[PDB]
Assembly symmetry: C3
Homo-oligomer: 277 residues x 3
């Protein structure tokens, strides 16, 4: 029963009220955050949506996960405000989410500024589990926040090479890669040509992955026919995304400075990763 | 084909003969014993049943597991006698029980006082696996043994708060709890009120589990309407029970000194845990 | 679409061309090699088949795995030649084989003597994964190679005791055994008698496995009626075989010096282990 964004909150002290009947997305998101070794999660609440921001440990991957108010069962926020969340503190809580829980509710109150409430309801036995999590008023990492604008559809012209993987294909490819390498070359000749993923280790092993049919992986290219697009990229952050299997299918966009953007949409959740090279 | 208690034993030297077509209960019981870190198992044989006694490592939880002779396929014991069993010695043996085994047989002979025989039969290939386990004549822990009387239905009046969990509910609740705490408060106001399980950790996290409908968890209360029942309990031994998932559904009884009794009945097996506070 | 051995190779530089639509056998074979802690794999190519040779770490078990050219989808070899393969180098590659791969292709070229190509094709997305593995020209372990002749059907007369296990029975028996022992006694009286597997550890545990019906495990015996066949054998290498579960059913042959031969046939794969005592 989804009602979207509300004009006024149920409880009068609520600066934020959030409810949603697919709490498993929070588990997967936070498994992703754990795989990235994020220490702290930056949370922006606005009247239209809530956004989770984080870097990975190496600071080179930027993650922006957005849940649109209009797509959940219940949403309310008084204004724009920020919360900082210790990821390790909430790790076991998000992992405890399972199928006995059909609802997740999130509440932040004016009279309790350092507290974030998480309520999970079990409907078979009228059980209600309430977490009270200590949160902070976060110093803002502006570079991370501004990255959100630098993944707008508008700005993605300098990305001549795109394609789509299911989460199983992505996991397979990059787990296979990380068995033997930390870096992989992405190479694609202009024109109707195959996509190459490969690396070479001298006097041991080389590996080469080739995609012969572009339409089977929804590849699109604006590489000039006579040019070769070739970048070298670090793959650990990709395996992290892949393994967390947050969402069904994943769009991959490449640019010639070797930046990678992964986009993934699961229901109310919009997930963006940009990783610099 | 269940025949219950027998007048005379098949083999003439048998002080004990025991056979049963659900050997998986022994696996689960002994997984429970392992989770408790029991070192030694105290075994009482009588002409009507066999009972396994143990404490957990901390000595504060008492376990009494009874298999009634009348409920198995074959039973015989000459008299009352005691055996001590090294739990670590038999650990891998009980764990090796699987579905290829449709029968467990236990024999103790007069001419072999320090030996306990365990025979598992595989009927697909006429395979017979016989363990000969070195056992001892145990010094008796009387406190442990007498506890059996202190869980008689008769004596459980001073237990004003009772309810029932399935093994999945019990595992869920106490694994969720042990993610963050070693102690939990059980609190229940007199009257038609909700059951509370909760704890509080300062400047990090608090958690609160609430059961709104008593009938959904078969709760019964004799707490005086105007009184509050509140106890604090250690939860490790509970997770042990929960995880071993010995039996389908579990009765929980509380008293105001904070003692807990868990009762569980699987077929021929009756399992009682009392844990002092 | 299986065409067997070819007169001439597709690619003109190929000293070896091999293709096969059951690549999972390579995964299992190499899981077996890993369980044995083999360091190096000895590979013989001939115009009719390819054979993998190895010892286990203790040097007492000899493994000979043969894939007959006539039974695969495509085979070609110019002549007889040998390759050495570092097992640890290829370990993750063989383990990455899964159901997305419907074809494995192996190529060795004249112009690249130190290289072995492994190509796996994914047909859902026209994906082609190519490994280039550094290989060597191996010094030959003749004892290992000659063992192949010493498992010919012709030479197996001095093996009076044989029987067959499924891989589940073999795994069960020897995992159960290795819980408690490194050695087991195989004992079988002449005549229509039960097969005994057993061991004895003083003042702890003894175990005895008995097979009452010979026909249920396809046992055959040429032990003279009045004689007792009894050998003691090391079981680690057996658990290795069992666990790798390379093939559906396994023939076990025993001789009185306590040598054991395990034989197993999966499709194109013929697998022989002889382990000396």
């Amino acid at each position: 029963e989804r009602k979207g964004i509300l004009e006024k909150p149920v409880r009068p002290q609520s600066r934020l009220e959030f409810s949603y009947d697919n709490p498993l997305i929070f588990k997967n998101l936070f498994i992703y955050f754990k795989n990235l070794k994020s220490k702290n999660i930056l949370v922006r609440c606005t009247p239209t949506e809530i956004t989770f921001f984080s870097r990975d440990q190496s600071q080179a991957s930027f993650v922006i996960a957005t849940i649109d108010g209009k797509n959940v069962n219940h949403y309310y926020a008084s204004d724009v405000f920020w919360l900082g969340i210790n990821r390790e503190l909430v790790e076991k809580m998000f992992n405890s989410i399972d199928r006995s829980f059909l609802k997740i509710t999130i509440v932040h109150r004016y009279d309790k500024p350092e507290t974030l409430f998480f309520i999970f309801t079990d409907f078979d036995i009228d059980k209600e589990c309430t977490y009270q999590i200590t949160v902070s008023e976060p110093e803002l990492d502006m570079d991370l926040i501004e990255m959100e604008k630098s993944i707008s559809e508008e700005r993605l012209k300098n990305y001549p090479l795109r394609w789509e993987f299911t989460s199983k294909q992505l996991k397979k490819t990059f787990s296979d890669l990380s068995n033997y390498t930390e870096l992989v070359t992405i190479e694609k000749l202009g024109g109707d040509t195959p996509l190459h993923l490969y690396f070479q280790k001298f006097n041991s092993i080389s590996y080469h992955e080739m995609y012969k049919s572009s339409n089977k992986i929804n590849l699109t290219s604006t590489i000039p026919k006579s040019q070769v697009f070739q970048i070298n990229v670090k793959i650990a952050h990709i395996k992290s995304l892949a393994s967390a299997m947050v969402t069904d299918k994943i769009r991959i966009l490449c640019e010639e400075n070797g930046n990678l953007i992964f986009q993934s949409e699961m229901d109310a959740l919009m997930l963006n990763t940009i990783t610099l090279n």
